[PDB]
Design a protein around this ligand. Structure first.
Ligand SMILES: [Ca+2]
Ligand SMILES: [Cl-]
Lengths: 65, 157
């Protein structure tokens, strides 16, 4: 699991997926390969019920709240 | 090709922006789009059904979607993949959405029953009849479960 203080609020999965991730009470939409805005973290995979992050050269899971 | 989705307490504007990305479509937002969206796909949806979900969830919030055909290359052809959308002000409680196939009957035959149930269930609950003979249900899970059982009973009866 991710140790980053960010909350996964929504996940829409398909051929063109997207996640809504919150940080500091602000919600923001991310596509795969995009960087997290708050931390230097890359949404490497958007899967059905979770996101996999690349943070400081490690893959970490961010699950739904 | 299908869409699954799970949204809990998501800003309307961020929901809207996600559907746009999923569908590969520019969505233009009127002023003062605000609110909260929650939904979970109990079954996958195809592009039409997902767009219908969209329409359904915005409507619940008091927001209408208006499609616009814009010719960005002055060629005299506006291809389906280039439609723009404008948004504007017009446990058993979980918001869920489900697709129910109907194997033995025309789906429109079931309308006057489901009409009665939805009137009774109250707002937020919506039935959509797909031309491929499947019924799509959006609403509170308890209600979606009671519609699913009535659909299926009539089907196999
Ligand atoms: Ca054109
Ligand atoms: Cl035009």
């Amino acid at each position: 699991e991710t140790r980053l203080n960010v909350v996964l609020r929504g996940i829409a999965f398909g051929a063109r997926p997207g996640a809504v991730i919150e940080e500091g009470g602000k919600q923001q939409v991310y596509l795969q390969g995009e960087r997290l805005d708050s931390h230097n973290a890359v949404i490497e995979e958007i899967n059905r019920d979770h996101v996999m992050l690349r943070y400081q050269g490690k893959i970490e899971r961010l699950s739904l709240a | 090709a299908t869409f699954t989705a799970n949204f809990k307490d998501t800003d309307l504007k961020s929901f809207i922006e996600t559907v746009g990305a999923n569908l590969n479509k520019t969505i233009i937002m009127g002023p003062g789009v605000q609110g909260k969206v929650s939904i979970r796909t109990m079954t996958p949806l195809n592009e039409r059904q997902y767009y219908q979900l969209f329409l359904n969830l915005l409507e619940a919030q008091g927001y209408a979607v208006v499609p616009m055909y814009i010719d960005t290359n002055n060629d005299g052809y506006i291809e389906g993949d280039e439609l723009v959308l404008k948004v504007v002000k017009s446990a058993g409680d979980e918001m869920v959405t489900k697709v129910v196939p109907v194997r033995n009957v025309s789906v429109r035959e079931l309308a006057p029953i489901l009409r009665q149930m939805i009137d009774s269930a109250g707002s937020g609950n919506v039935v959509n009849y797909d031309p491929s003979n499947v019924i799509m249900l959006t609403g509170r899970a308890s209600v979606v479960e009671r519609l699913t059982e009535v659909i299926q009973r009539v089907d196999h009866a």
